[PDB]
Amino acid sequence: ITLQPPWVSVFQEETVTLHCETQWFLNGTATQTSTPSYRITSASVNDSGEYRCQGRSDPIQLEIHRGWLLLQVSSRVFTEGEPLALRCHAWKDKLVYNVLYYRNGKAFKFFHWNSNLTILKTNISHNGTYHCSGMGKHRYTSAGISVTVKELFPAPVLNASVTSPLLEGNLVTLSCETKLLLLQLYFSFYMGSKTLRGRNTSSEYQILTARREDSGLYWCEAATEDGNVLKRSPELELQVLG
Amino acid sequence: PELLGGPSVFLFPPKPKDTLMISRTPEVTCVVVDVSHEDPEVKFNWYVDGVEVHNAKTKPREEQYNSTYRVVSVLTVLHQDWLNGKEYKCKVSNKALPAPIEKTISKAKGQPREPQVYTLPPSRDELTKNQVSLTCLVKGFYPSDIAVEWESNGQPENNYKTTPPVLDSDGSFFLYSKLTVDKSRWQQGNVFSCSVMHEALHNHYTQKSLSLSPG
Amino acid sequence: GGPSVFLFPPKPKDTLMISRTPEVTCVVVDVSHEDPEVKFNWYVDGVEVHNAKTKPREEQYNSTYRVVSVLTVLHQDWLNGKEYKCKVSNKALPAPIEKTISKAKGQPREPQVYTLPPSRDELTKNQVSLTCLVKGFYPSDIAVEWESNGQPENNYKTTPPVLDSDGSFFLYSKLTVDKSRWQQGNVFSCSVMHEALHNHYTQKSLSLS
Ligand SMILES: *[C@@H]1O[C@H](CO[C@H]2O[C@@H](C)[C@@H](O)[C@@H](O)[C@@H]2O)[C@@H](O[C@@H]2O[C@H](CO)[C@@H](O[C@@H]3O[C@H](CO[C@H]4O[C@H](CO)[C@@H](O)[C@H](O)[C@@H]4O[C@@H]4O[C@H](CO)[C@@H](O)[C@H](O)[C@H]4NC(C)=O)[C@@H](O)[C@H](O[C@H]4O[C@H](CO)[C@@H](O)[C@H](O)[C@@H]4O[C@@H]4O[C@H](CO)[C@@H](O)[C@H](O)[C@H]4NC(C)=O)[C@@H]3O)[C@H](O)[C@H]2NC(C)=O)[C@H](O)[C@H]1NC(C)=O
Ligand SMILES: *[C@@H]1O[C@H](CO[C@H]2O[C@@H](C)[C@@H](O)[C@@H](O)[C@@H]2O)[C@@H](O[C@@H]2O[C@H](CO)[C@@H](O[C@@H]3O[C@H](CO[C@H]4O[C@H](CO)[C@@H](O)[C@H](O)[C@@H]4O[C@@H]4O[C@H](CO)[C@@H](O)[C@H](O)[C@H]4NC(C)=O)[C@@H](O)[C@H](O[C@H]4O[C@H](CO)[C@@H](O)[C@H](O)[C@@H]4O[C@@H]4O[C@H](CO)[C@@H](O)[C@H](O)[C@H]4NC(C)=O)[C@@H]3O)[C@H](O)[C@H]2NC(C)=O)[C@H](O)[C@H]1NC(C)=O
Ligand SMILES: *[C@@H]1O[C@H](CO)[C@@H](O[C@@H]2O[C@H](CO)[C@@H](O)[C@H](O[C@H]3O[C@H](CO)[C@@H](O)[C@H](O)[C@@H]3O)[C@H]2NC(C)=O)[C@H](O)[C@H]1NC(C)=O
Ligand SMILES: *[C@@H]1O[C@H](CO)[C@@H](O[C@H]2O[C@H](CO)[C@@H](O)[C@H](O)[C@H]2NC(C)=O)[C@H](O)[C@H]1NC(C)=O
Ligand SMILES: *[C@@H]1O[C@H](CO)[C@@H](O[C@H]2O[C@H](CO)[C@@H](O)[C@H](O)[C@@H]2O)[C@H](O)[C@H]1NC(C)=O
Ligand SMILES: *[C@@H]1O[C@H](CO)[C@@H](O)[C@H](O)[C@H]1NC(C)=O
Ligand SMILES: *[C@@H]1O[C@H](CO)[C@@H](O)[C@H](O)[C@H]1NC(C)=O
Ligand SMILES: [Zn+2]
Ligand SMILES: [Zn+2]
Ligand SMILES: [Zn+2]
């Protein structure tokens, strides 16, 4: 399911349409509409609920509201790396100015003229409750909404298999260590700013016979296939003695 | 291009004096302003501790200097209900509002405290003027709702002014009332009285006198 | 979008004591991070002056900025009724915003000041009230304090000015003190500062008997 107006939160009496990518399931029961598009011409309080369509689609929770201002988001649950579109929407599309966007009770952005806001690559710091406010004939404030941004994988740690003062001619394995939290990850190993081994599904890299000149600072990067989550490890100090 | 916004509502308590004399009729007043030409009609619902009552009196819309309407509704409240802390809720509906507006009002909360009432005669240095000031100090009282007046010989005195209540450091209130009188009347021995009405007096009324002593 | 401007008078006490430095304060709020410098021009009875001290923008908790400009005013200028105009210019404003301020106008009148002892009836309590009546003053700007034996007394409260029936203002000030301290004969004094007193001040004493 997709939405014209993207927003999962809409005012009473506004139009929104759902396209299915047929049968429509609202709150777990079937409705008439056979169309591949569901038309709410004038939203009412009974249009709030969980929507599904035809195997079968994930749920979408649609909220109909009343108020002066309504903070609109495109969904309520994100993975790290995804974009979050926000809008401070005035009832009957009237004018507000000097608008503020809030995260967890802290204003984080101010526009002289009402404007929507898109956080292009989200992450755990974006997780929280958002509201907006704005000046019309009086200062008006929206209800808060919950947004969720879930960590895909923590930042990797480079781990070596022998501790740092180590001897010539040893085997040592470096491991780029990170746990996915539900596609697989791609790893690359480095020494100073130089590349040791490039993008690969293997999370390990061997120095077969360590020599003195392998002494340096080693780190790694773990990236999703498409790469819109890419994270690096801190540097580990590794020494080979003669 | 039109700025967002509709009417506003202010909900006013009764006058202290109306709440304190059982022969008077205290009222709560719900006032709506910025009612537009576009959406003129306004509706009131009233609740006493959450129960709808129906005996409110609604006056007709009056157009103000700024081309918006003002609409007032008055609910009479029972003496004992007000003093016993019942909550009066005014609900205002109008098409320019996204949702009805609800305002609630009740007596201020906290343990009531008895006013201490002291009369102070005029300063010696004032007694060269043609008129003198008779002072009534009222302190230690809670809540701030109070009424003060002056009498002499059964008749009320009109030439007085009273400060508003002022928060003292112990969380109670005080005020002063000043009655101006011809010095001749003070000199002749006339008895003047400062009368105070407050919830925490017995019968909500006390009276203290003041006169130049004889002999 | 619209910064807003607020123009504040000096503290009455700063205007009535020649030792102090009274100031007018022009505050501009809702300036955005993007907005360029907020510019201030200041006028005294319509003549520009260049001795205003304008502060750097300061980010507020709501992520907007606030900018203050302070102009010292001279003792006789303020009391003679001169007008101070703050003019705020910025790209975020289509037209500059102007605000003017001066001393409240009307013929000054000198307060009379009277100290009243505590009532006999109050002398059963652990603390008693000493009263200072200040009446017949105009304009309403005023400061009242209490002292004893050379040091401020802190436990007092003063009503606001109230319009009397002749167009002048009055107020009362209440000093609360331990009963013992009153009966032991200590001298207290009520000090009033107001434009129309000679040198803008007077002091009246109060003690037992
Ligand atoms: C178009 O025209 C309308 C009429 O214009 C008037 O304005 C002047 C300039 C002149 O033109 C006159 O000819 C016109 O009458 C405008 O209507 C006015 O709108 C403003 C708001 O914009 C109202 O302001 C509120 O006023 C109350 C106090 O009002 C009483 O006292 C007034 C004198 O100060 C008096 O004029 C009023 O009639 C009213 O009188 C009382 O009436 C009752 C009932 O009859 C009597 O029983 C009383 O005894 C009597 N009192 C007296 C004295 O006579 C004030 O309380 C409001 O302040 C609250 O809200 C503010 C938000 O705006 C806030 O800033 C304040 O801090 C305060 O906040 C409250 O704080 C308390 C804590 O104590 C909380 O409990 C509250 O929750 C909290 N509320 C908050 C934060 O919101 C406010 O100042 C004004 O009353 C109104 N006039 C009339 C008349 O109806 C209109 O605005 C204008 N519109 C436009 C777009 O131009
Ligand atoms: C982002 O934050 C900014 C501030 O930080 C805030 O932090 C948060 C956490 C919270 O604590 C806030 O409270 C903090 O302020 C916001 O800035 C504020 O913005 C509002 C308006 O948008 C300003 O409101 C005005 O306030 C003045 C009174 O200001 C004094 O007193 C305040 C406390 O009561 C105090 O906080 C102020 O700092 C200021 O203090 C004075 O400061 C000076 C010098 O700096 C000293 O010399 C003084 O001693 C000192 N006094 C004290 C006490 O400390 C108020 O007067 C304004 O009201 C008039 O104008 C209104 C128009 O907006 C109107 O609605 C009112 O009815 C009133 O109208 C006037 O009526 C009289 C007649 O009665 C006429 O004489 C006037 O002509 C008429 N006005 C006209 C015609 O214009 C107004 O309420 C607020 O001051 C400002 N705070 C600071 C600090 O700068 C900012 O808003 C916020 N932005 C957003 C988008 O959220
Ligand atoms: C599908 O289910 C949703 C809820 O998940 C239904 O929405 C609710 O149903 C009715 C609308 O007629 C409302 O009772 C309810 O809103 C109530 O909530 C407030 C307090 O929160 C209460 O004070 C009101 O009186 C009001 O009754 C609706 N909204 C929500 C979020 O619960 C919806 O109707 C269902 N639709 C169908 C077709 O089954
Ligand atoms: C992430 O954000 C969520 C949602 O903002 C936070 O959860 C709050 O989540 C719920 C929805 O409002 C409420 O049930 C809770 O009051 C509160 N969460 C808990 C666990 O009590 C959550 O705190 C955030 N957590 C992290 C780790 O980022
Ligand atoms: C999540 O992403 C945000 C936004 O991209 C990161 O914020 C940094 O970027 C801003 C510019 O927008 C810059 O001022 C600072 O470098 C911010 O820290 C943020 O780092 C990132 N947070 C986490 C926990 O990964
Ligand atoms: C929604 O349905 C229920 C009754 O089944 C009721 O709340 C109301 O009549 C309906 N409201 C609308 C706008 O259809
Ligand atoms: C809101 O602003 C964004 C960023 O400028 C832009 O892509 C778009 O026109 C607007 N989005 C919606 C959903 O209206
Ligand atoms: Zn890199
Ligand atoms: Zn009793
Ligand atoms: Zn001088």
For chain A, which residues make up each domain, given as ranges?
A: 1-65, 66-154, 155-242
What residue of B is the nearest CA neighbor of C117? B120
Cα separation of A231 and B1, whole Å?
A: 45
Question: Which method, experimentally, gave rise to this model?
Answer: X-ray
What are the chain C neighbours of B180 within 8 Å (beta carbons)?
Answer: 165
Q: Are C193 and C177 in contact (CB under 8 A)?
A: no
Instruction: Give C107: exposed, middle or buried? Use CB within 10 Å, 0-12, 13-18, 19+.
Output: exposed
SS3 B36: coil
The residues pairing with C105 across neighbouring beta strands, listed in sequence order, are none
Cis before residue C96, ω within 30 degrees of 0? no
Question: Which among B122, B137, B166 has CB closest to C129?
Answer: B137
Three-state DSSP string of A113-133: ECCCEEECCCCHHHCEEEEEE
- Joined together, the tokens standing for residue C46 give 């319509």
CA of A148 from ligand 4 middle (Å) equals: 8
**CATH code for residues A155-242:** 2.60.40.10
Q: Is the minimum distance from the CB of B106 to ligand 1 under 6 angstroms? A: no
The residues pairing with B78 across neighbouring beta strands, listed in sequence order, are none
Hey, which CATH number is domain C103-209, 2.40.10.10, 3.90.25.10, 2.60.40.10, 3.40.109.10?
Answer: 2.60.40.10
Cis before residue A156, ω within 30 degrees of 0? no
CA of A20 from ligand 7 middle (Å) equals: 23
Amino acid type, B36: S
User: What number of helices (H) and strands (E) belong to chain A?
Assistant: 0, 26
DSSP state of B79: H
Three-state DSSP string of A12-51: CCCCEEEECCCCEEECCEECCCCCCEEEECCCCHHHCEEE
What residue of C is the nearest CA neighbor of A132? C62
Question: Which among B4, B8, B34 has CB closest to A68?
Answer: B4
C173 vs B: CB within 8 A: no
DSSP for B60-76?
PPEE-TTS-EEEEEEEE
Q: Is the minimum distance from the CB of A129 to ligand 4 under 6 angstroms? A: yes
Q: Which residues surround ligand 9, an ion (CB under 5 A)?
A: B 202
Residue nearest atom 2 in ligand 6 by C-alpha distance? A46
CA of C25 from ligand 2 middle (Å) equals: 12
A111 vs B: CB within 8 A: no
Cα separation of B114 and B107, whole Å?
A: 16
E strand or H helix that includes residue A219: strand A216-224
How far, CA to CA in Å, does A36 sit from each of A22, A24, A32, C60? 6, 9, 12, 50
Q: Which fold has domain A66-154?
A: Immunoglobulin-like (2.60.40)
Q: How many CB atoms lie within 10 A of CB C149?
A: 9
Q: In which residue ranges of chain C is CATH 2.60.40.10 found? A: 3-102, 103-209
Q: Who's near C207: CB < 8 A, 6+ residues apart?
A: C185, C186, C187, C188
Cα separation of C29 and C36, whole Å?
A: 14
Cα separation of C86 and C68, whole Å?
A: 11
Instruction: Give A131: exposed, middle or buried? Use CB within 10 Å, 0-12, 13-18, 19+.
Output: buried
Cα separation of A119 and B126, whole Å?
A: 74
Cα separation of C181 and C123, whole Å?
A: 12
Q: In which residue ranges of chain B is CATH 2.60.40.10 found? A: 7-106, 107-215
Q: Which fold has domain B7-106?
A: Immunoglobulin-like (2.60.40)
Task: Specify the residue for token string 């000090």.
Answer: C191
Q: Are B109 and B142 in contact (CB under 8 A)?
A: no
Neighbours of chain C (3+ CB pairs under 8 A): A, B
Contact: B3, A137; criterion CB under 8 Å: yes
Tell me whether strands B192-197 and B173-182 are parallel, antiparallel or unpaired.
Answer: unpaired
Q: Which fold has domain B107-215?
A: Immunoglobulin-like (2.60.40)
Q: What CATH class has A1-65? A: mainly beta
What are the chain A neighbours of C35 within 8 Å (beta carbons)?
Answer: 112
How far, CA to CA in Å, does A176 sit from each of A162, A190, A221, A233? 15, 11, 8, 8
Hey, which CATH number is domain C3-102, 3.40.50.1260, 2.60.40.10, 3.40.228.10, 2.40.30.30?
Answer: 2.60.40.10
Question: Which among B119, B168, B174 has CB closest to C119?
Answer: B119
Contact: C174, B116; criterion CB under 8 Å: no
What are the chain B neighbours of A92 within 8 Å (beta carbons)?
Answer: 4
Q: Who's near C5: CB < 8 A, 6+ residues apart?
A: C26, C27, C28, C86, C88, C97, C99
Q: Radius of gyration of chain C from Cα atoms?
A: 22
Residue B60 distance to chain A (closest CA, Å)? 25
Phi, psi of A214 (to 5 degrees): -80, 0
